Amino acid sequence: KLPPGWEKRMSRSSGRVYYFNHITNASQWERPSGGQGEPARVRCSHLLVKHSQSRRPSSWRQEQITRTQEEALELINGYIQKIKSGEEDFESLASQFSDCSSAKARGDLGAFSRGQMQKPFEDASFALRTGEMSGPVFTDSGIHIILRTE
Template sequence: MELPFMQAETGLPEGWEVRHSNSKNLPYYFSASTKESRWEPPSGTDTEKLKVYMANHHSAPAGRPEVGHGEGMIRCSHLLVKHRDSRRPSSWREAEITRSKEEAIEILKGHEARIQSGAANLGDIAISESDCSSARKRGDLGMFGHGDMQKEFEDAAFALQPGQVSGIVETASGVHLIERLQ
């Protein structure tokens, strides 16, 4: 399914549009002139406009259950804040992430406070603030088992009960809040 929209609305550079991958059920970025497609936004993207556009047009419905999950599998959402020492310090939100790890933790503490107070839930915040491409799906990572995620992430995720949100978890990718969905 093709979803071309004006650059003014998406914040993408001229010639780029948002399309939808049926195989992965995720939006991606496509340049009609060069036929290039990519999961990360192209350089020159107005990330603030893109965040608003993606939140309005590409957020998955909450609580949509996954089918076909096996024994020993869990489902989680997460909110990732990357920093300059993350293994890949760029995201769909920012081409180059320069914040320190301490600054990333402070940002995440603010999100954690909003979640704990009931002012917002993790999925709502993840849509616009997570540095992971899963933001498009409210941070939902789908079903996974032991050995599928980085050890620190896996240990924290499997320690949660459904409905619980972790404290801050540090991995090579950055700092996370994790919510166990099932």
């Protein structure tokens, strides 16, 4: 019934029902829908937070990325909450805080097909519908938030 990846869950903390995508790690309160397959190409922006265990623990923001994986996840979760609240905008946060050179393009990576990005990033990107934002996506580079723009 629900689009690919989506499952109806309940919070262990709360008792509140929500919807979770196992492929993008996205969470939301709203039901995600009221032979299509997947798009052959998508365009995505992303915000990357690296940690000490990233493949290249360095960025234009700092030579020596020393935050732990848990601290990077906490930062990612904070950005997601700020975007969902309306306090901040995705592109603005990516320009300021993404540990990837695509920050200078406000996170934009352009269009791509399967087989071009790391598999977790690719799996999440192609499970997003246009306009949707992922949850935390773990790759060898670090933790990403992904926004599908096309």
